[PDB]
């Protein structure tokens, strides 16, 4: 019964209690806000090819 003197908690159960959650990448905040601010650029810039300024305030000609 030498196995009953070994630590009963497995090496697996250490690696799933220490590494419980997949950690958040540093770059996943950049490349997720950048793709969402690229829609703020598109709609709201005045130099974009798809501005909403002629759709929401139609021009007086």
């Amino acid at each position: 019964d030498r196995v009953l003197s070994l630590p009963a908690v497995s090496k697996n159960q250490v690696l799933e209690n220490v590494f419980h959650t997949a950690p958040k990448a540093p770059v996943e905040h950049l490349e997720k806000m950048v793709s969402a601010n690229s829609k703020v650029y598109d709609a709201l810039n005045l130099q974009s090819k798809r501005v909403l300024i002629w759709q929401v305030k139609p021009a007086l000609f």
């Binding site: 305030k57 021009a59 007086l60 000609f61």
Partner: protein, 221 residues
């Protein structure tokens, strides 16, 4: 150095920026009538686009704008009829010489604002001596063409046109206002009809007195 199309591009870049105020959009409109810019419609469109966006409006910039809209012959009902919001809030703040330009421009465009012309006729009969004869005709042109059949003003204007004889252009505006009201008062039409052989300078007021006489069916002059 006398640059008229190069000053249109300098006016175009004044009203194409982001935070044009009332005074900068008044004077852009005033400069487009003195320059007689009927050919460029988009530049007149950029001015009335900023004229709806402009939020503060003192007494002098509202009447300079409304003069320029009326004199320039530019009409956009949405822009001009929402300029009656500044006017009913600046109405005790307005000069008697300035209230004639507001009500003539808002009336001549057809702005259906009964709160404006009720308060702007009650002012012009509370101070009837304070208004020169050209100003009582401009208010009368406005209240008539704004859809108000105010005969209280048309009597008080008729007592002024009998006491003092008026200019030719002053009378023909007053005839045109009484023609739309459909009044045909012999006491006041003939008091305004004597102003038309001292020499008239425009043909627009000879043609409008022509229209106003025939619509009331008086006879030619």
């Amino acid at each position: 150095e006398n640059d008229v199309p190069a000053i249109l591009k300098e006016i175009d870049s004044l009203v194409s920026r982001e935070a044009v105020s009332a005074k900068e959009v008044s004077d852009a409109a005033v400069a487009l009538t003195y320059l007689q810019v009927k050919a460029n419609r988009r530049l007149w469109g950029k001015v009335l686009e900023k004229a709806g966006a402009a939020q503060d409006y003192d007494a002098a910039s509202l009447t300079n704008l409304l003069w320029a809209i009326n004199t320039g012959g530019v009409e956009h009902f949405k822009t001009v009829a929402e300029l009656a919001g500044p006017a009913v809030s600046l109405l005790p703040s307005l000069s008697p010489v300035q209230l004639s330009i507001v009500v003539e421009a808002l009336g001549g465009a057809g702005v259906k604002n009964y709160e404006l012309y009720n308060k702007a006729s009650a002012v012009v009969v509370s101070k009837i001596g304070e208004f020169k004869p050209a100003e009582i005709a401009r208010v009368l042109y406005g209240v008539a063409f704004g859809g108000v059949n105010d005969v209280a003003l048309a009597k008080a204007a008729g007592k002024v046109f009998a006491s003092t004889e008026v200019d030719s252009r002053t009378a023909a505006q007053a005839l045109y206002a009484l023609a739309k009201l459909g009044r045909a008062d012999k006491a006041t039409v003939d008091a305004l009809l004597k102003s038309f052989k001292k020499g008239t300078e425009s043909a627009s007021d000879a043609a409008a007195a022509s229209f106003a006489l025939g619509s009331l069916s008086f006879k030619a002059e």
